Design a protein around this ligand. Structure first.
Ligand SMILES: COc1ccc(-n2cc(-c3ccccc3)c3c(=O)[nH]cnc32)cc1
Ligand SMILES: COc1ccc(-n2cc(-c3ccccc3)c3c(=O)[nH]cnc32)cc1
Ligand SMILES: O=P(O)(O)OC[C@H]1O[C@](O)(CO)[C@@H](O)[C@@H]1O
Ligand SMILES: O=P(O)(O)OC[C@H]1O[C@](O)(CO)[C@@H](O)[C@@H]1O
Lengths: 439, 439
């Protein structure tokens, strides 16, 4: 016995399945957002979902407000949110129940692992109902409460993403701000914060206090909750810029060879000088510079005359047996391998090498550190850059291997609202094109 | 410009240092343990130090009680700890100040990065003094308080590691327990828990409540504090067993070839059957089985008839250009490389390959998951096993590449007191010997 076969795309050893003539073919989690409006619940929901999906955990946000915008006509005022508004209170409950119905369908019938229930969930009654829903559907419940009553932070959220909401199209900036403040007040009487000391002692929760200055963590049940908690503790909303680029053109680039540890070409050295001038012109307070352990990124960083840190995790995707070969030589020596990759570029593993899937797992610590840091310049490689960019730009596993990241071009990332503003800066130095479109 | 050279041992690209005829040649942290006696402060101190050293952060514990045992004669009773004991109170303060003096010498003059100050530090006055010491020496201060008043947990700590203390050699189990309870009571009046709400609002701290059921986290300043917090949140004291072994003997083992993805030899298949019988005889509640993505570990797990999980992080050390070669062929084709490895086995990086140092970084997520889990069987490879074992057995980077991990032998790890009890179980199946002693 013990007969195994290696799967063609992913290169995984599986038992040879000599299936007879008639062949036969862990618990999901509901993340409950808790808190008054303008407490960054949607910011947390979106960011956490972006991270979880990128690491390979299927996650989806269910925002009760969007179910409400669908059911109700155009928004008039805070009067809709009044506790004495009998009709709207019924509508709002129906919307929450409709979102939960879609949560059940996502987790039990669509292969989803995490459902982020993005609502106020400010009352114990609403949360008791969510817990009942979770228990009878065999879903785990994990609560994330954001507590911040700083008026500057509240006003900043209203100004950055609330006033621009479809609800406030007919309102001006000042009356949307005034309406939203009244809207928050509608929730303040009934608001029962999480109490892990007495009432919510058995609940799995995190209390994010004053934009992540302090945390109350109670009863973390599993791996995924522990990961979420770690992530929430590393992220921040301080202003910053992320610059991402590849090493300057190398000798392998000129020969159309993949992988290797070749040095900068004459043009690559020219880009490196151009990059130093660019960096200088950005006039950044304290820039952290990260490179791979491969020569071409280190030579590029050397031109900056700035301290830099080499990460083995930033090294280009390992092509295994195909290292230092041209794509023509890959097609002619390994035709089966070439066609398999073309068909499934994300999951395809090179023989004795890696997949984009392996890269994501390697780059997880890079992402966690990028979150912690304020200004960073990452000098890396084509496949590495695509992964990092897919995380920041919320791109799927399927689109990730095809993202355009040309040589001698800086990608300037500015975190704004619920994403990244991406600015491209070509440093006017010629190079070959290493981008290959799908077939 | 941009001229680099690759360092012989570690394979790091560095600027060619054309040093002239006259060549010229981040803040440490004091971790402050806080809490009454028998609160697992020494358990936390030792475990955290073991983890931090293993990941490459030089860490040392400074236990004030050991400075006291050195200054004072043999221990008589709790009377030494009385608040009205003027003389012993002076001695105890002197001991704390002597430990801090050694903290300063470790962090500022010995290249240490983290000093774990293991004492009660129960008063605000003592903590104010530690903060003053940290501020004037330019050290960061991070507080770890353990709060647990459960009498079962307190009694268990006294029974497991207190009664066996050199202090209680002349006392019997019952009178050591009675003396220790009186000793704790000496500290209870003056005890001022950390107050991150009002008084300790500006301090960087973690409050570990009821053996890690709940956590209060305030003002995490840097990377290392964030890592510590994550680690404390993943560890537990629930009873469990860790079984570690290599895959059954493979075809490359028979040929004396390194690396590769060869399958089990006839003896390797025999071990796999023997392992299944062994596993069955252990009568474990719920065993998690982990393998690498290499065929030989998967074939071994296949014999168990148990579900298993494949980790790419458990794949054997990458030998780069030396993969699938015998050691004789390495010495004859790459003599410089062979001698360099022999001289510096931990830091040595194989060309286009890895070092034991790279393995530790890869295995960090494995260690974190091993901590979270209760019963686990890890079927892996020689170098991978040495790293994991060095973490559990608190072995240095220098000794790690030489740890004996023979084939067809299970290493049964039982966490007891402040370490691991290691039991070896040879499953009576012959194999070749792949262990190579130093030169
Ligand atoms: C761009 O629009 C934003 C709107 C809101 C936020 N935000 C993010 C947090 C926040 C919460 C926990 C961790 C990190 C940030 C937060 C808050 O605690 N209170 C109000 N607002 C908040 C950020 C951008
Ligand atoms: C083997 O001797 C031990 C002595 C003490 C412990 N211990 C560990 C913790 C503990 C604390 C935080 C996280 C994990 C464990 C703890 C405690 O909160 N209160 C009393 N004791 C304790 C374990 C073994
Ligand atoms: O992105 P692709 O086409 O999958 O391949 C990535 C390749 O691109 C390069 O960065 C250069 O073309 C190589 O280092 C790497 O092998
Ligand atoms: O432990 P060493 O002697 O440094 O080398 C590790 C080698 O041992 C093996 O496990 C077998 O000898 C190989 O897979 C690996 O290359």
């Amino acid at each position: 016995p013990l007969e195994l076969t290696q799967s063609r795309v992913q290169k995984i050893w599986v038992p040879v399945d000599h299936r007879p003539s008639l062949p036969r073919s862990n618990s999901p989690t509901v993340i409950v957002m808790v808190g008054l409006p303008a407490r960054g619940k949607t910011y947390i929901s979106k960011k956490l979902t972006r991270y979880l999906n990128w690491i390979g955990v299927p996650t989806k946000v269910f925002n009760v407000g969007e179910y409400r915008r669908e059911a109700v006509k155009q928004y008039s005022s805070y009067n809709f949110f009044r506790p004495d508004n009998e009709e709207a209170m019924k509508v709002r409950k129906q919307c929450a129940l409709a979102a939960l119905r879609d949560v059940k369908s996502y987790l039990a019938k669509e292969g989803g692992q995490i459902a982020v229930f993005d609502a106020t969930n400010t009352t114990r009654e609403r949360r008791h109902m969510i817990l009942h829903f979770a228990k009878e559907n065999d879903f785990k419940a994990f609560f994330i409460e954001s507590v911040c009553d700083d008026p500057t932070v509240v006003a900043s959220n209203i100004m950055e993403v609330k006033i621009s909401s479809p609800d406030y199209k007919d309102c001006n900036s000042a009356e949307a701000m005034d309406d939203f403040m009244k809207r928050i007040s509608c929730y303040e009487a009934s608001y029962q914060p999480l109490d892990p000391d007495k009432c919510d002692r058995d609940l799995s929760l995190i209390k994010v206090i004053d934009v992540g200055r302090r945390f109350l963590v109670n009863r973390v049940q599993d791996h995924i909750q522990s990961r979420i908690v770690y992530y929430l503790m590393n992220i921040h909303v301080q202003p910053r810029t992320i610059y991402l680029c590849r090493h300057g053109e190398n000798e392998h680039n000129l020969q159309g060879r993949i992988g290797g540890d070749s040095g900068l070409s004459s043009r690559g050295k020219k880009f490196a000088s151009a990059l130093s001038k660019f960096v200088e012109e950005q006039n950044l307070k304290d820039l952290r510079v990260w490179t791979s352990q491969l020569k071409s990124t280190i030579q590029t960083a050397e031109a900056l005359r700035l301290p830099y840190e080499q990460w083995k995790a930033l090294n280009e995707i390992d092509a295994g047996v195909c290292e230092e070969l041209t794509y023509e030589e890959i097609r002619d020596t390994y035709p089966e391998e070439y066609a398999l990759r073309e068909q499934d570029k994300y999951y395809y593993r090179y023989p004795t090498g890696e997949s984009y899937q392996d890269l994501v797992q390697r780059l997880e610590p890079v992402i966690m550190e990028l979150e912690r840091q304020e200004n960073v310049l990452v000098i890396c490689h084509q496949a590495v850059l695509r992964c990092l960019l897919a995380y920041f730009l919320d791109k799927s596993a399927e689109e990730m291997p095809y993202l355009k990241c040309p040589l001698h071009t800086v990608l300037k990332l500015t975190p704004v609202a619920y994403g990244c503003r991406v600015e491209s800066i070509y440093l006017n130095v010629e190079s070959v094109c290493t981008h290959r479109e799908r077939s």
